[PDB]
């Protein structure tokens, strides 16, 4: 989707807010910590999302005005809500009512429950991770060193193909192997893995600029075609 999230190459967002590392506080509000717990806790159990693909599309679907103002963990809250409702884990009406309760009475008590089995399960997920690497029977269409065409495609659903790289020539830098295909997986349409490549693009090609800059982007096979 050609959304507000896809910012690469945009002008006008201003200076980067530099801060020294030691002063770069992770969390300033408890709800931000909670957002992390919600995301990892749900994902570890496959609730609403099993990999990050579905997670990302829920963020991408935010209203632009929300995306730009919610703050970062606001994205995480938005996508957990989106995905839990979308998959039928939570009912939208119930969620909205409960939201209203905490809006009007922020000090409403949170129910307590200990589940050490669930802790172990979550811990296992944090340490084991979840690799999207797969094997497929096909061979790679492209080879290291090949000049390829990064296609002009405009999926309305999820994609990992940034707009700034579309309709451009690039050079294959590496064949990673086959990875779960985001444009399908984010919409629960199957892993349908495809070869993933790293592709180098020159500044002259991306922007028409004259400096010694390049961008290395990872692109799925179906994003590209031979020249």
């Amino acid at each position: 989707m050609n959304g507000i999230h896809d910012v690469g190459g945009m002008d006008g967002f201003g200076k980067v807010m530099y801060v020294k590392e030691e002063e770069d506080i992770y969390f300033t509000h408890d709800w931000e910590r909670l957002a992390f717990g919600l995301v990892a806790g749900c994902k570890a159990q496959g609730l609403g999302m099993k990999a990050f693909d579905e997670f990302r599309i829920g963020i991408e679907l935010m209203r632009p005005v929300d995306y730009l103002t919610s703050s970062y963990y606001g994205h995480w809250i938005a996508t957990v809500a989106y995905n839990l409702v979308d998959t039928g884990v939570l009912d939208e009406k119930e969620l909205d009512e409960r939201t209203e309760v905490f809006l009007k009475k922020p000090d409403t008590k949170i129910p307590r429950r200990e589940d050490p089995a669930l802790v172990k399960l979550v811990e296992k997920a944090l340490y084991d991770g979840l690799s999207p690497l797969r094997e497929i029977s096909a061979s790679p269409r492209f080879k290291v060193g090949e000049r390829i065409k990064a296609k002009n495609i405009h999926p309305t659903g999820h994609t990992r193909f940034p707009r700034y790289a579309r309709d451009k020539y690039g050079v294959i830098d590496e064949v990673y192997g086959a990875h779960v295909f985001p444009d399908d997986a984010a919409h629960r349409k199957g892993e349908n893995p495809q070869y993933l490549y790293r592709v180098r693009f020159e500044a002259e090609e991306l922007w028409g600029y004259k400096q010694k800059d390049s961008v290395y982007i990872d692109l799925w096979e179906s994003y590209m075609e031979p020249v």
């Binding site: 910012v7 690469g8 190459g9 945009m10 967002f13 201003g14 200076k15 980067v16 590392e21 770069d24 509000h29 709800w31 909670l34 992390f36 717990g37 919600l38 990892a40 806790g41 749900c42 990302r56 005005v65 929300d66 103002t69 919610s70 970062y72 606001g74 809250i77 938005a78 809500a81 939570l90 969620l95 409960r98 939201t99 905490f102 809006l103 922020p106 949170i110 129910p111 307590r112 429950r113 200990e114 589940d115 669930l118 802790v119 979550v122 991770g129 979840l130 690497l133 990992r160 940034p162 700034y164 993933l196 991306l206 400096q211 010694k212 800059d213 390049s214 961008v215 290395y216 990872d218």
Partner: protein, 202 residues
């Protein structure tokens, strides 16, 4: 709110806070989450992980030529052997800064960052200014961090559009003769492993 213009009106951050609590409450009531599962995650990301892990890898590379060689040849095997592996750190690559090549890592589409090796990303890393600009004018972005590279130095920006993650291996600075591996590790900054800074002489 004029119903022609609902899109002018953002949710306040109090909404997200309330929404978070509502999700937490409903999921615990339904048996999907527990208090201790949520806390376990918070402990991991706020306290257990951090850039010190990457710093140790950098210092080892500086002090042990054979290790640096193995790391650059097959980073994913080497990093997994060290235990720096996990969620968002399943496939970690390492790219070396050299005198004429400077590496910078970004996730233009979101925030992708190798938590198991580096901990949580910088505030600015996740925000639009860095994300938008670094792929197009990296020299201008780097200058805002105090890094003013000569035109003759090539910049390679690594946009994390897949689950493959990258760490930058920065060069050992002058003035470090005789330092131990542990002492060199204390020199390695988070920013240097993203590519937005060189390491200063001590």
């Amino acid at each position: 709110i004029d119903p022609r213009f609902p899109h002018h009106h953002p949710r306040p951050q109090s909404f997200w806070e309330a929404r978070a609590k509502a999700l937490e409450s409903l999921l615990i009531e339904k048996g999907h989450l527990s208090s201790d599962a949520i806390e376990r995650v918070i402990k991991h990301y706020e306290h257990e992980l951090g850039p010190m892990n990457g710093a140790k890898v950098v210092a080892k590379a500086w002090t042990d030529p054979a290790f640096k060689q193995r790391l650059l040849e097959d980073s994913e095997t080497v990093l997994r052997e060290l235990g720096y592996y996990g969620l968002q750190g399943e496939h970690i690559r390492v790219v070396e800064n050299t005198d004429t090549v400077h590496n910078v890592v970004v996730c233009t589409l979101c925030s992708c960052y190798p938590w198991p090796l580096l901990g949580l990303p910088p505030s600015w890393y996740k925000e639009p200014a860095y994300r938008a600009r670094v792929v197009k004018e990296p020299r201008q972005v780097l200058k805002e961090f105090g890094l003013d590279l000569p035109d003759s130095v090539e910049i390679r920006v690594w946009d994390r559009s897949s689950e493959i993650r990258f760490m930058v291996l920065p060069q050992r600075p002058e003035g470090t003769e005789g330092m131990t591996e542990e002492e060199l590790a204390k020199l390695v900054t988070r920013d240097s492993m993203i590519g937005v800074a060189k390491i200063e002489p001590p």
